[PDB]
Design a protein around this ligand. Sequence first.
Ligand SMILES: O=C(O)[C@@](O)(COP(=O)(O)O)[C@H](O)[C@H](O)COP(=O)(O)O
Ligand SMILES: O=C(O)[C@@](O)(COP(=O)(O)O)[C@H](O)[C@H](O)COP(=O)(O)O
Ligand SMILES: O=C(O)[C@@](O)(COP(=O)(O)O)[C@H](O)[C@H](O)COP(=O)(O)O
Ligand SMILES: [Mg+2]
Ligand SMILES: [Mg+2]
Ligand SMILES: [Mg+2]
Ligand SMILES: [Mg+2]
Lengths: 140, 140, 466, 467, 356, 228
Amino acid sequence: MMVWTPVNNKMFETFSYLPPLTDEQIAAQVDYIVANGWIPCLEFAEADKAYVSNESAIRFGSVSCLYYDNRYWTMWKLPMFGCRDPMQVLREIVACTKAFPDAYVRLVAFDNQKQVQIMGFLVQRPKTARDFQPANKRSV
Amino acid sequence: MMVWTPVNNKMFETFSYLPPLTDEQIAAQVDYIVANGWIPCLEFAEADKAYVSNESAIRFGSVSCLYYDNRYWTMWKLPMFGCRDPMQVLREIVACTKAFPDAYVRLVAFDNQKQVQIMGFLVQRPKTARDFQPANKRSV
Amino acid sequence: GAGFKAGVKDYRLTYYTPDYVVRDTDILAAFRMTPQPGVPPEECGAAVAAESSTGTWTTVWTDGLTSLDRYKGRCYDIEPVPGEDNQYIAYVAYPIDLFEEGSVTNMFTSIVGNVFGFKALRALRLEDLRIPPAYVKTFVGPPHGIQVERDKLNKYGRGLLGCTIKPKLGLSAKNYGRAVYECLRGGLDFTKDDENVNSQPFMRWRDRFLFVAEAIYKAQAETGEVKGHYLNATAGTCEEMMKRAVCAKELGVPIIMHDYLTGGFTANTSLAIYCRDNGLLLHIHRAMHAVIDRQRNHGIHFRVLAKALRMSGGDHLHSGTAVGKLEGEREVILGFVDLMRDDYVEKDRSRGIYFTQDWCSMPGVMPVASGGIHVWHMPALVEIFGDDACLQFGGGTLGHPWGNAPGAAANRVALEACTQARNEGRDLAREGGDVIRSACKWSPELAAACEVWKEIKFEFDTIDKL
Amino acid sequence: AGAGFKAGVKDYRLTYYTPDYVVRDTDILAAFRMTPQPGVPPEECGAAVAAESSTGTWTTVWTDGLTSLDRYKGRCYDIEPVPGEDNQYIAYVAYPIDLFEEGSVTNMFTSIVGNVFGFKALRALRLEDLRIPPAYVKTFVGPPHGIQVERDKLNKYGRGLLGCTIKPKLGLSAKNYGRAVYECLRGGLDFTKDDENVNSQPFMRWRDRFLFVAEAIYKAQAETGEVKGHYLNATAGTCEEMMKRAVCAKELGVPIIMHDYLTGGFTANTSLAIYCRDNGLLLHIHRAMHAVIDRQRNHGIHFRVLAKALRMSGGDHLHSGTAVGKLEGEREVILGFVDLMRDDYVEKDRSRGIYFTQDWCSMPGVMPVASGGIHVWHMPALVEIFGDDACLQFGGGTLGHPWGNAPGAAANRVALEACTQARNEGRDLAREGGDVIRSACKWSPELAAACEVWKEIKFEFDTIDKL
Amino acid sequence: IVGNVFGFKALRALRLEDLRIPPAYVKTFVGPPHGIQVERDKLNKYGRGLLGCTIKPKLGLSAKNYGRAVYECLRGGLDFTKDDENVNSQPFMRWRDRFLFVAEAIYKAQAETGEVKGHYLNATAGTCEEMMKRAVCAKELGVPIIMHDYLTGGFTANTSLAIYCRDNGLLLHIHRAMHAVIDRQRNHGIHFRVLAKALRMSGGDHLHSGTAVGKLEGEREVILGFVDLMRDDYVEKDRSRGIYFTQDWCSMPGVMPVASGGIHVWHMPALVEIFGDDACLQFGGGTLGHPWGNAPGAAANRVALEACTQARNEGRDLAREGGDVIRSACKWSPELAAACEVWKEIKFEFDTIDKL
Amino acid sequence: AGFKAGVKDYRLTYYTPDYVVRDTDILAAFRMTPQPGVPPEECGAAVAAESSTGTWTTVWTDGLTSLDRYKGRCYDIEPVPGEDNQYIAYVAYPIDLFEEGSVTNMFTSIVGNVFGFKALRALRLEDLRIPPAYVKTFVGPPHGIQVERDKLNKYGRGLLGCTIKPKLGLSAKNYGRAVYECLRGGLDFTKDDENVNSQPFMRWRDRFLFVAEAIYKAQAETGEVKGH
Ligand SMILES: O=C(O)[C@@](O)(COP(=O)(O)O)[C@H](O)[C@H](O)COP(=O)(O)O
Ligand SMILES: O=C(O)[C@@](O)(COP(=O)(O)O)[C@H](O)[C@H](O)COP(=O)(O)O
Ligand SMILES: O=C(O)[C@@](O)(COP(=O)(O)O)[C@H](O)[C@H](O)COP(=O)(O)O
Ligand SMILES: [Mg+2]
Ligand SMILES: [Mg+2]
Ligand SMILES: [Mg+2]
Ligand SMILES: [Mg+2]
């Protein structure tokens, strides 16, 4: 029996239980966005604004149900409307992570028919983050 | 497309989106107070009391609408009632910043007919402040 | 014109109207009908139309005070059923005027109230209903729906993962919260009360709600992901049901559940309205449905019960698994999953969709695949449902040899590996086993789960055939 | 080492088939007519049903060890073959009282009938009967009033009560509704009623109806000198709308409301029954949708279980069937659950489908209501089947009378009183019933007119729900 | 006053130009929940016009996308954003979902900028009961400001809401939707100045006043007349601005004029010159139409506002040097420069219908 | 199609002369008077745009959603006979644009801002097509004609009413005196003048009370149901 560690084992929603994505794996996900005609977009946040929190609820009556701070991140430029070039998305990842090397950065895509984010995953975490485990240190 | 930075880009209400005011620009603003017969006043706060916060709302029922801590700052002496000399205002700026070199200091003016503060801007921030950007670093 | 004439006449004289052109505001019903010997299909269809709308067994004078043409239900078409000597699909049209606005209860009371018990028929099954936009618009509908739910949870790009705590009954409130915490922290988005977990001597509801809240918040802080547990508001009275929903609201937790058929449509609609007004997600359990919907010859098909739930209100509804311990064929499930999720679903008899259904922007309901499923089913589940579903592993989590957190991790790893493979262009029907086996190489949790349930399948002759 | 956690699938029968179990007097018992898939032993199928309606799932869970499964598990403790059936068995399951929420029919159903009917490993499943122990019965408020209190409140004794559904089902205006109700009540009927599907609709809004019906009720009562009522329908889309309608009836001072308990649901029904108890309204229960569940022999839930559940949830009247009318239900089957609805104690009697002795521990009885396709010639049979403690309803049988509602009411009332009198005098209604009716026709033109119109009218078909 | 007389056969046209509301009647009204001075004091905002922005497209956005747009707008230097007048509760976005996401956005932008932020959450509804439900939610979220369409919801509902806002500390933004049905034509109807006096009495903290230079009609001199009637305690008769009567408000609080509709960065100098500091200036398309997105759009408008305010304070003539002040600010502000380039040629100049 | 910042003609998105109206669409007939130099098509499109989804410049946020699904559509323009510069513009609004059961919201979209646009000289809404699927969202009248006749027990002739005069200035007791005298002579109803609410000369609750007395007196005297 291996034991799933509760210590410094923060996750990041979709694909965070898989081994870290290679550049080829990221490119494959970008090709999937393009193949489906979805709208690519990058979002970023400093480390303090990265995970869901409750601080604004100090101002509330009994209305905190499904309210969390830090769900919204900051938009890198605009969603890439009309983008049909995966290399364009990859170049924006490079540009975003260069401008904000110490931020968390995620790639998302929007479907305008459902009007919902249709995919998303973390593409950068700051090098100073110590709150996560290698795939093989998730259980001890 | 340049991206407005969410990181360490705190503002300070009126004039904080312009380049930092020169001494000549501050003097022009003081002349404007005097020309209009308004009452000059200085206010100051230590760094922890500078920005609006919510801590007192822990004591509240559902009455936090338009309540914030740190709107009030500390009055430097008294409002300069009957002041018609801009040099007098500039001397109090020097006096206030010398007594509190590590405080935020703002210059305000009151109109007693409307009974409202009629102007205001930051004249000093502590040298240790790291939560603001120079004008050319606000976007990336 | 025409005097009142006392006495019995054939229903078909008034209620069989084969040349009637249906109106776009009519509610339409497709009845699989088995007449008694000696009862013509036309008279049997007319009897069903009559006794679910305006008519009784003998002529009444009071018809003359009103306009029967305006109000009567109309059997307007009868199809023979291929392969059946004594089965017919009778199509009935009901004027919109017959129905109370916003009341699924009233719609069922007319359409399925008395007609199934008539001596003159041997069996009757309601297969489908065409709910027109003008009637759909009278309903509040789901508290939130799929898009709003994902937005509130901040969860995108994969199926959601859930889990029913086991044993069904017998756990204390504290042990319940202990199990919930261990499940959620390993990678599941949700856990849930079993359908029959309400308030009982071994575990009172408010004790459970409190310990579960502690568990939710511990797992959320630990993982950095939004967590929830469907707290059961199902109760003996509307007043008890509401008390439970209020407590969930006051704890700030995301989601409650209701057993809509055993609690009932009246209580369910009330609860869905409460959830809308207070921002709670509402998970719907379909306990008792198979009493009604299992047999081909008699009852009400689940697709009708699913449409009724969408109207009454629910953010999630159980849909079946195809591959698990409970019955429901893939093609049948795909039909009503479209009816649950989509805005517009074209008639498609090969999936049992008898009518084109326009939902006129009523939010979609998240299908929940649950019951006897495990890690090896993951590729098939992802292929069937796509991302907009919740997949639930009760035994498939709490039956893991290393406990709940490793169990949750195994299911989460399997889901994400399948999703990734799907996104990369892989064929999950063919390559699913390979995707799972590849993931086992870097995931000891998954490998342990795969080993335990490798031989486990549920394959039986299907009762509810199209 | 002791018994530990072993991950994996094992047969349900290892835990949930306990053929030597001695049932406790607090256990809830279920009789399931079960049709296993080929290759599934009856023991494993009975055990799967017991497991998945109580404590177990498809694979072994470690959490069982934190609790005591022996204390909480459902137990298949007996399996009978069904005579005449190659692949049908009656599986008997015992549920500890600890499994159930007090006072909640909803929760009892959720366990016993929640998931098991959809299991791939069975082809069909029908819940035939339930043994509700006194210790569980006592947790329920029960019917708002019951038969004795109802008769006392109405001041009605010595005969069946007579009722009538207003027709057409839908399409009448509020004023025309109250007009028909007035004419029905004044001719001798004790009650009229909203059709089950009459709630609130574009052709007639509920509160307009309630008011005109109140006027009609009070007019007929003043005119006849007998207490009158009309079951006003509180069935609604939400609990709040249901309650508003009950409140309006309370504020009008009228005797009785109705609820469709299966389409409204048990949760709302129990609430309404409690409201009726607290405000002194009679509660008529309509069983709309039951035959979706209860018609077929091989699958569903027999009506007798649905009737027991209604008694527990709360209702002063419940529809029982007629035997002779337009809707199915055999005389012997009906007599079984009529005893279950009315009586305090009912012994096991498989010849009437009573699988368990039932002790109601003083919970009031529910008035059976015979309704649907009945007329004056059915009266002797109806009085013979039910006795005085029933309500007999003639909708078409009143509003289909050639002379109108008041003559139609009077004919039904004359027919009831003539048959009751003959019964009291020692006459055999099964043999002399036609003579009783023809004798009454001689002094009653209203009855004569009704007899002439419906003389040839019978409803005789092959019964689907055979024992 | 306007109940039956406009329909009389014996007249061809009737227009109510002005009303003299006497102090003795003014004193019977609760009036604005807060007014200009109290609003500035609660927001801690002094020395410049306030800046707002209507989210676009008008309809069709989801609750989450609404909050996303709001956060991006507020974080770039706008004080407020708002629901469009017709954003109430619809199938594409239910109100309570919006309120919650918008609260998140408000609190994110406020923590990010260090300035108090708000978004006018629309309480306009089909019934008073729904209207109040929405106000209550705003109160329980602790947010500063809600809005009401006072003509389409109506005076009875509006007065009730203004009283609620007074009792619960909520700022109340008033949208004048439907006014032009009534106030556009010179020969018939009711002049807006009367509709503005009525709003002041009924209760509102903000009221749309027109722009003079934007896409909707209202001449500078006409606007200046009723802006005085909205803000000031005492306004002398002045027929050259359409003021038929001397109006004494007997200390009833002033209403903040809101200039909105078809305005952009190049209009800034004229807007500041017309209104002075006590106004809210709103840029919907003028923010969400910026080539670089909402935050750069917000920053451009904020920079333009502050640059004009600073030039004004220094003694510069905005009426006459407005372009130079804007062009100077473009040299250190790429955001402003991008906005100036896109909207350089854009003007709204048509013959005025509502002439004095 | 990406985001292009800047102003373009409304007619490029909002004039759709080949649109087939849906049976759930709200339809509006606008009598429109454009300013000189504004084509009827651009004027109709501006009305359609600014009463539904559009503003004066292109917004990037359109791409997050489906403008085709939500936009108001000027689908037809008729010249007005006898008029050189008047047109009937026909606009179609998707049912999704409207709050269920809210006349307030329907008016706010359709007549909210467009009447004040500089680019038009005049605008009149002539008619609206309220589709069944929208009508059904409204509770509607408390009773309606049939139910009113039934509650009053009045059939076979017009009902007769009467506003008490002088409009203002009568005391509560005089009001009830006048009401009684009117009702007892054969009128079915009397009424408060529209501007009679509650005033120094007559407070509402005093009037309600005296009027009740009058209603019941006249009803007892005549044997006919009376109201005020
Ligand atoms: O009670 C149960 O069996 C479950 O908790 C699943 O447990 P496991 O995960 O341990 O199998 C669910 O309620 C069923 O899936 C309901 O069936 P359906 O979804 O068909 O309505
Ligand atoms: O709708 C009807 O058909 C009835 O009103 C009877 O009408 P008639 O009197 O005109 O036949 C009753 O609701 C049925 O008896 C219900 O059946 P059951 O009692 O079997 O539940
Ligand atoms: O709907 C609109 O057009 C606005 O949101 C502005 O949009 P833009 O900022 O994109 O122009 C405002 O409601 C109008 O200004 C109202 O007009 P007024 O102030 O005259 O009442
Ligand atoms: Mg379960
Ligand atoms: Mg009936
Ligand atoms: Mg607007
Ligand atoms: Mg009048």
